[PDB]
Symmetry: D3
Subunit: 153 residues, 6 copies
């Protein structure tokens, strides 16, 4: 119930993996001071993706999104820290890469909406839902970062 232990779901999409951005993206979260809790590599099924993007069932791009997210492996991640959901999105940049600012992950590394390299949860509620959807509870590891007292007061 601690603010500093909030968690978010970050997924590196198949274009991110294919273009070699996995380390660069993870690096950005480490240097910010957030803590890695969950990490895995899989080719997501369409049933998983249909559940993940369930709020978009009725959008013309939903079919192409589900099937594109299936077309290659993704990196699934859970990161933990104070306001990690909100600050994650800031670090990611705007969902539509056209408006992402240089310095953000999307603003620095991608161009088009169908190919926006990354996803991050839009709310603490979406996060807990997405974490449970992609991770099993035993796949989430907690540890104390040696630099915790220098990240948090």
């Amino acid at each position: 119930a601690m603010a500093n232990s909030e968690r978010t779901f970050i997924a590196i999409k198949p274009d991110g993996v294919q273009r070699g951005l996995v380390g660069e993206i993870i690096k950005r979260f480490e240097q910010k001071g957030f803590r890695l809790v969950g990490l895995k590599f899989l080719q997501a099924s369409e049933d998983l993706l249909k559940e993940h993007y369930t709020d978009l069932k009725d959008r013309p791009f939903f079919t192409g999104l589900v099937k594109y997210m299936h077309s290659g492996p993704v990196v699934a991640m859970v990161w933990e820290g104070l306001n990690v959901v909100k600050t994650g999105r800031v670090m990611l940049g705007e969902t539509n890469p056209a408006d992402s600012k240089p310095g953000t992950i999307r603003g620095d590394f991608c161009i088009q909406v169908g190919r926006n390299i990354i996803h991050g949860s839009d709310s603490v509620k979406s996060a807990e839902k997405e974490i449970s959807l992609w991770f099993q509870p035993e796949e989430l590891v907690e540890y104390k970062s040696c630099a915790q007292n220098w990240i948090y007061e």
Copy 2:
């Protein structure tokens, strides 16, 4: 074809002198834009008076043409979806004082007369600046191996 749009980017003589050529090209590559043209030359004053012809009546114009002739520049053509507008965002505000950190100008320079880089401000200007600095046979068209992961 929206994905084939081109913009002219020029690394100005201070950008070449301060060692920023690779860093600037690296940013356009890692963004996903595709290099089409690349040369290194000391631009002539006639070329520069035509490049900055809209500034002909401004009090800084003669100094701009003269300074831009004082060293070699790196002339580039980049291709991609909305590469003109997005390229300008990557460059930062023309005035380095208002450039945001993360942009080329925000990270790498300070003052307006030494703003290290230029990019076309419109599709119409890009087409003119490309034809002004590059000959058609100097612009190379190839398919990036990541084309299907950059564009849907």
Copy 3:
């Protein structure tokens, strides 16, 4: 080239900045921006120094915990010089509150919480002159001409 280009600001890397190994990365950003380094030292600031440094915050509820924490480890104190370096230096640092710091800034990229914002920079020219005189003796500020001066300033 002008003496407006001689403006100076005080930048201090806080104990969290030193502990988390950001000293080089921070100095790099000022170097690659074109600012010139004028003073650089490494010390554990005394409480008298810190209280005088944050004299304007003497009546703030976080003052005692700010002064003790800044004393709890060593800091890197720097003086940088350049046109509008005070204002531009605050832009590079990002918002004082890390939550509002944009990506691309020092705080937006490297820290999370207000008590641990890794870096301080003078907020005005008057603050800078008072802070530089507070942390650096005149003999510890070195002036030299950058080989790139003529390509940074017109």
Copy 4:
């Protein structure tokens, strides 16, 4: 094929703690090797004793297992021509004292007990370590978009 060789790379608990996961993964990506498996776990002691089974009688074995159990690791499988041998070169000498600048250990660590990373020393060891740390359901095979530009 030869280009489908695989090695097991594990980022030890000190590399996770010191914020090295991204940097390490970047070096394998930019080298051109392909990521096949990736997980984050706290290895059990039983797994670690089988992983280091050739060291049962070394005076550091018990402390090595205990240290490798003290915190989570990142476990990885990478694929490519000679990834086992080249992987070890990238890592640097097992003892960081001897690792050259430019390697992971040469750049990032100091002491043998805290050498941030492990990589299989042979194709035999790799296959054994991959089977030990990964199940078939965790190994993803995809075709990199740059394959024909990394390989003949």
Copy 5:
């Protein structure tokens, strides 16, 4: 003048395709070498066949030319003290298997047929390769603002 030695560096089609152009130029800039020529082109097969004329009897020659012609390349001239020999050191062993981490091929490529870059092996070869790839009009000479901090 010894500090005026020049070498020819070519970023091969795989280096362009995998987005390494900026990273490579950066390494030469930060070392303190000076860019003298820079161009982007698709090399004709006649040019490539003369460039590699010493290799025409090797079994790999036909496929080397095809690979070197399969996409555009970035051709470059770089000037500095012992730039021919030191460029090779920076590039790494021609065979990427032998290249050390910290070199260009050591950090970025794997296989002999896709080794991302070429540098002249001698001053004599350099003068030949430069004349072959660059016309006199395409070379620039300027004083680097750091020359006196690079060279006593």
Copy 6:
């Protein structure tokens, strides 16, 4: 505290060409990311007398007078770094004294070219390092603290 070998110190000086070419942050970052601990740091124009004492073993060599004049000609970053075998490993990190022999990935291998502009100096021995540290720094300028990752750097 740890074993006393973990507390060895070396003197590192970023020369005027290191400062002029914008390498200060890059150099410090390599020492930080390697695990070593920063113990002293100052910016100054060293007097020729200081430099003649620093290089006293070279006082009769043909390059000595110009090396002394050159090192005085602009400001230097003087640092003290602490860690296991930091003297020897620091020298490996810097690369060979002659830049032409310095391998890529080292400080001199990546960033410079010629003998008289080799951007950096590091102590060559423990004994040298004690002498240079005392020459360049007063003891009250050397700061002792515990690195938060010490248990992950040292066994």
